[PDB]
Amino acid sequence: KAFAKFPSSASISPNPFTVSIPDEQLDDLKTLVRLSKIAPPTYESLQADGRFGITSEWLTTMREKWLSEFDWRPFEARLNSFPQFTTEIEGLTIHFAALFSEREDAVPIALLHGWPGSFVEFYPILQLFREEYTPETLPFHLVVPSLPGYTFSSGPPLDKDFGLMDNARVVDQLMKDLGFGSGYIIQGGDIGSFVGRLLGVGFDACKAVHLNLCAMRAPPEGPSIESLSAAEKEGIARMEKFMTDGLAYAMEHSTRPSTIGHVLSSSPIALLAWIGEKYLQWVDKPLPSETILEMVSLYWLTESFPRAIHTYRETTPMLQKELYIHKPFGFSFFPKDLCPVPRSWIATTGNLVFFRDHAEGGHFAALERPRELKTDLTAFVEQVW
Amino acid sequence: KAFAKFPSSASISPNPFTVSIPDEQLDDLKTLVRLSKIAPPTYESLQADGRFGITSEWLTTMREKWLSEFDWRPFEARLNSFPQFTTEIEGLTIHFAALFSEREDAVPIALLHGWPGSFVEFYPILQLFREEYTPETLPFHLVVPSLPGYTFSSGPPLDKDFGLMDNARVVDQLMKDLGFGSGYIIQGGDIGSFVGRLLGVGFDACKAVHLNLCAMRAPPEGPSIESLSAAEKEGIARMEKFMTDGLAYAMEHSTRPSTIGHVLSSSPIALLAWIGEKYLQWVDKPLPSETILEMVSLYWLTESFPRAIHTYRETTPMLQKELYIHKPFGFSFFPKDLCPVPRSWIATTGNLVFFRDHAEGGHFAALERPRELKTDLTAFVEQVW
C-alpha cells in the first residue's frame, strides 16, 4: 500500500484493482494457440529482412514459446506490483496504475499510452521512481490511465461514436477526480500524444505537455524541406516511407474497424501476427520475445483490440493554428520512432520551451529508453512548473 | 469424358484432376470454426449499414450456418462436374477446368479469375455452354485456369519474386501447350484483367482481349470529368470512394503480404471475415450465404490466401502508351463493379472495337450475370476473330 493513498483533495473513493485472470481463460488461450494454423511458407514469409511482415520462422518459434515457455502468472504479479484502481467516468470503467506522493506539493502528471501499447508500457519508469524515492520524497503524482477501450478499462460506448476529444475529456476528468483540477502535466506518445495535444489546447487544468511524438506535414509558412539538415532530411524520408509502405494496418483500423476487430479476435495467433509485426518494426533494439507475448496476451485476455481502434478514424482519416499548444510544450526525440520530424517543424505547433535529442531508441520510448524518458520528463517539469 | 479431349495440336498429355479433400481436413475446419472466437459487440460491429465492415450479427449467423448447414461434399461434386486437369509449367502445378470442342476450327478462349475468386467463378458460364452445345457443335475451346497461387495451382515460387507478367507468361504457355499457339482470346476481370492486358500488350499468340475491369484515373488528353454524364460522374464517385474508403485490405496485401497471410491462415473465421466482407460489398444482388461459405472454405482448404496475394505489390502499388492494347479490345460494363469508368476513358487504353453497357450486376460478373457475360463474349469473339 506504499504510494497507494489518494491525494488529499481527491473527490472519488479508492477502488483498488488487482489483475486476476481465471485458469480457464489461460487454458483456452493455450488451446486456441495450439489449434491455430501457420500459413504455408511463401516467398514473402521467407524474407529475413521482414520487409513483407512477420516471417514464418518468427511466428513458428513464437507459437512454440507461447505454448511451452510462456507463463501469464509472473507477468500478472508484475502488473499487480504497483497500485491500480478503477473509477467510473461517464459510465465507463476507467482503470489506472499510479504512484501517489505523500507530498502535498507533488506535481501531478498523467502518462498516456497508445496502440498497441497500454499502461504497462510505463511500468519500467514507475519502477525507477520506486527504486529511487519513498512516498514521502516522491516529487510527482504519477497517473497511468488505461484509455477507453484498452485492457482493464471498459468502453468505448456501443450506442454512439467516440473519438480523441472524448478520450481527452475522460483523462482530464480522472485528473480532476483525483484532486488535480488546480493543475496537471501530460506526458504523451503515440495516440496519447494526440490526446495530450488536445488537453494542452483546450483544457484549463492541463498546464504543460511533454510529447515523444509529433506526427505532422511540412508547415505551411515553413521552414521548407530544403532548409533541413541532411540528417533531418533522412528523418523526413523515413517518415514518408512509413506513410506509404507502413500505414496499411492503420487504414484498415480506420476504414474497416469491425472487420479487422473480428479477424484479430478469432485466434490469438492472428493477434500476435498483426501486433507482433509492430513490436518488431517500431523499436530500435529488439524487445525480448516474452515481452511481446505478454503484451499480446494482455490484449487477448481483455479483448482490447476491437475496442481500442476507434480513434484510428480520427488519427488516420491546423497544428499551427487551432491545435497549437500555447502552454509550455516539451519534446523528446528518439530517432527510430516512425515520424521523425525536425525541431523547427515541431516548434511551429506549440510553445516549445524544451527539446531533447537522443541518439538511440524507437517508438516505444517508455519501454526502450525508460531512463532517458524519465530524466527528460523530470527536467521538463522542473523547468516549467 | 464429354468435352475432355485435348485438341489435336496439344503438346501435353491429359492429366485428369479430381478434387478430393480428406475427412480429417474437413473435421479440422469444422473444429476451428466452432472454437474460433468472435469479437465482443462494439459500436462499429453494431452498425447495420456495414460501413465499418461485417457486423457481429452477420458473422454470428454465418458461423452457425457454417457449422449446421454447410456441406463441402455437394460443392466438391460440383467442382468435379466439369473436366479438370493439371500440367507442370516452370516447376509449378497449374490446374485448369475446361470444355474442349471437337471442332478443329473452335476459337480458343481462356477466362481469367481474380481475388477472392477462382476457376469456379466461371462454372455458370461453362454450364450454359454445355447445355447449349454438344462437343461436336461447341464453337469455342473454354479454358479456365487457376492462376499461380490459387486453389489447386501451386506456387508462386519460394525463391524469387513473382508478378503480373509471370502470370501472363504462364497462361500464354498453358494455351500453347494445349495447342493454341496459332491464336487465342482472353476474357479477364479483376486481377485477370491486369494479366489479360499484359497478354494483349506483349504476347503475340493472344489475338484479342475482352475485359470487365479497366481500373484507371482520368486520361490526360480527354475527356474531362466535366463533360461526363451525370451517370458517369456517379460512377466516378463510387470508384473514388473505393480508392479512399475501400482499399485498405489491398494496401495490406500489397505492403505486408506475409503478416496478413499468417493472420488469415490462423483461423477460418478470420478468413471468412476478411473475404466475406468483399463478397458482401462487391456484388449487386446479394449472393446466397452458402456461396460465400463455399468460396471461403475452398480458399481455406487449398491455403490460397497467402499465396494468391503476391500480385497486389503490382496492382496496388501507362495505359495510353506502354500498356495500350493494340489488339481488338472489348469491354463489358457492370455498374456495381468497383471502378466504373466512362467508355471514353476505356477507349484511350486500347483498340476498343466492342462495348456493352449493363443496367445491373456487380464485381463478380461471371457469377452474378453469367448469361450477359457469356453473351457479350460470344458477340465479341465472333466480331473480332
Ligand SMILES: CCCC(CCC)C(N)=O
Ligand atoms: C496515432 C496513430 C499513430 C501510429 C504510429 C505512428 C507513430 C499508430 N500507433 O498506429
Ligand SMILES: CCCC(CCC)C(N)=O
Ligand atoms: C486488383 C485489385 C482489384 C480489386 C477489386 C477492385 C475491382 C481486388 N480484387 O482486390
